[PDB]
Amino acid sequence: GSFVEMVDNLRGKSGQGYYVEMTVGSPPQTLNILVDTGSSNFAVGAAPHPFLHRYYQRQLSSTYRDLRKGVYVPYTQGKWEGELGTDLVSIPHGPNVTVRANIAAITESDKFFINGSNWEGILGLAYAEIARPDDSLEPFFDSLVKQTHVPNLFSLQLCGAVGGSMIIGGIDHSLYTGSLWYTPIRREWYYEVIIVRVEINGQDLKMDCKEYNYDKSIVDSGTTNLRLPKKVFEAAVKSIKAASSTEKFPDGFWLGEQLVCWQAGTTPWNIFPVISLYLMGEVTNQSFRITILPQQYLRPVEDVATSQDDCYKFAISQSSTGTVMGAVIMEGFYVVFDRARKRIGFAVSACHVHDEFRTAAVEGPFVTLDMEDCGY
Numbered sequence: 035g036s037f038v039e040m041v042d043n044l045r046g047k048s049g050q051g052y053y054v055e056m057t058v059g060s061p062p063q064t065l066n067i068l069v070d071t072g073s074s075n076f077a078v079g080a081a082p083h084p085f086l087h088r089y090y091q092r093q094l095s096s097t098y099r100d101l102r103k104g105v106y107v108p109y110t111q112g113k114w115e116g117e118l119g120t121d122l123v124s125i126p127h128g129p130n131v132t133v134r135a136n137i138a139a140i141t142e143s144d145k146f147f148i149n150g151s152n153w154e155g156i157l158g159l160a161y162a163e164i165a166r167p168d169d170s171l172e173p174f175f176d177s178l179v180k181q182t183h184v185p186n187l188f189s190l191q192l193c194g195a196v197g198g199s200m201i202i203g204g205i206d207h208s209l210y211t212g213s214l215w216y217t218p219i220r221r222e223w224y225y226e227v228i229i230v231r232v233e234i235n236g237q238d239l240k241m242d243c244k245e246y247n248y249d250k251s252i253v254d255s256g257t258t259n260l261r262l263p264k265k266v267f268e269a270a271v272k273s274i275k276a277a278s279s280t281e282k283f284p285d286g287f288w289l290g291e292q293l294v295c296w297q298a299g300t301t302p303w304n305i306f307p308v309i310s311l312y313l314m315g316e317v318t319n320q321s322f323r324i325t326i327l328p329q330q331y332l333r334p335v336e337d338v339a340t341s342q343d344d345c346y347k348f349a350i351s352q353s354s355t356g357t358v359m360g361a362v363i364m365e366g367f368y369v370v371f372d373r374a375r376k377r378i379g380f381a382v383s384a385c386h387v388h389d390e391f392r393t394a395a396v397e398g399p400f401v402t403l404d405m406e407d408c409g410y
């Protein structure tokens with residue numbers, strides 16, 4: 035069960051996350067599980083639901099242990115509730131190991147599961163500090179590291195159309211090209227990082243760098259969009275509207291509320307600007323940038339009914355809880371969650387986005403002498 039078995043172990047549907055096959059219980063029950071760097075619970079559907087193909091049946095698992103403790107999680111988009119226990123867990127196309135881990139058996143939920151997403155649970159890969167009900171509930175990756183000899187690192191290569199790879203324990207050098215650039219993990223809760231500069235077609239947004247990270251910035255495979263604090267979002271939208279002015283779109287497009295469509299194969303990519311996010315480097319006032327093409331931030335919406343055309347949602351939206359570098363930002367980068375060294379590395383992925391004019395990039399180094407601290 036080494037890296038060379040772990041490649042192409044992820045699948046997905048656009049806008050609905052990326053999932054990996056896992057088993058829970060004894061005999062193993064196979065479940066598809068969303069890979070979520072934005073949370074820290076292993077939480078699996080454990081009762082029937084209109085949107086679940088299958089669910090964890092605790093009664094059929096000999097090795098299940100009830101912890102006699104409930105968990106209730108209301109969050110922005112929805113809610114879920116369940117019962118805590120432990121059981122044996124493996125990742126068939128992941129490391130060749132079986133561990134005993136905490137499992138939240140989801141017994142009731144509202145707008146948590148998605149119709150036709152093909153996943154039945156979430157694997158929260160962030161740290162204990164944001165586990166529910168509290169930080170005493172050891173996250174899965176912590177249990178994995180403790181119980182096996184797996185190195186304390188994983189990587190995600192997410193690809194647009196979807197699929198990709200989660201490599202646990204090391205770095206698969208066949209999954210990226212060029213250099214890996216690291217940004218520090220600021221605090222171990224979410225995967226919190228610091229953005230030092232934003233450019234839109236090379237034009238600096240010219241804001242105090244604290245605004246980019248009000249009130250935190252995170253790398254979150256469980257969020258589709260690039261989410262930006264209000265001030266930054268409004269400035270970004272003004273610049274992208276300015277760059278793309280040869281065409282005018284309804285306000286609903288800018289709000290993520292409606293599609294823009296063009297005749298099949300005629301999307302005018304080159305009227306849309308590239309977005310550069312400069313991330314704090316590992317040494318003082320050094321940074322690197324990751325560049326995001328419109329092929330990333332205009333997310334295609336597959337629909338047989340609209341298929342004479344190519345249609346997209348604007349996958350950048352306003353946030354009141356900080357910046358979220360979601361799946362559209364991670365797509366086409368090889369992203370290394372180097373927990374052992376408290377850092378996230380970015381490199382150009384095997385499935386990077388490009389046309390004949392422009393390519394997604396990871397480039398550095400950059401220096402800024404006149405710098406304050408960019409964190410809140």
Ligand SMILES: COc1ccc([C@@]2(c3cccc(-c4cncnc4)c3)CCC(N)=N2)cc1
Pocket residue numbers: 049050051052068070071072073074075077107109146147156158166254255256257258
């Ligand atoms: C432990 O409680 C939660 C609450 C919310 C989540 C969440 C989540 C919950 C359900 C579905 C999705 C999701 C939906 N669409 C696409 N990707 C992920 C995402 C919200 C934010 C994030 N990173 N994960 C995960 C665990």
